[PDB]
Amino acid sequence: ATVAEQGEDITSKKDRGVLKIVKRVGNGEETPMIGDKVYVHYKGKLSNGKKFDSSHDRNEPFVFSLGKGQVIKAWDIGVATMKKGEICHLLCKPEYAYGSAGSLPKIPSNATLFFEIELLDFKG
Template sequence: MTTDEGTSNDGENPAAIVVEQGEDITIKKDRGVLKIVKRVGTSEETPMIGDKVYVHYKGKLSNGKKFDSSRDRNEPFVFSLGKGKR
């Protein structure tokens, strides 16, 4: 999945509401962190536990102000799937 700028969701997809409002991914469901998928991946392949995953993201406040972006740094966020840092 990616979060490319300029990619739109025309509302024909059932996830259109999530794209517009964001999915609350907080434990308390207080809308402190919202996830918005801009474009769903099209590959049949999915990563397995331990695979290295590269993602781009943009962090924005509720007023729309951007506070972080992996694309601005031209560097994806990289992590091993299913392996937390301790």
């Protein structure tokens, strides 16, 4: 409800597909470029508030190459806006996440996802 009402629309289409609230400021003024390796911790919740995934259960950072579609669209878009050490909240419409297919059983069809994401590091 906070992110839905106060979050910044960081999509190009301005369709409110990805809404962002910074929770902890990062340290660099720098954000990752496309193709940079990004290292994140994250927690994801559905709209009933139920968890669906977290990097913290293994306590192992989630690692991906930014802007290569190795992750949901909301992450390629959101993580690009983050500074090293930043934590943000992202509210993600299904079009920018798992869509009508979902990711069953954990993620229903047409689910809006809520992520808390920490950008631990990134390297070009």
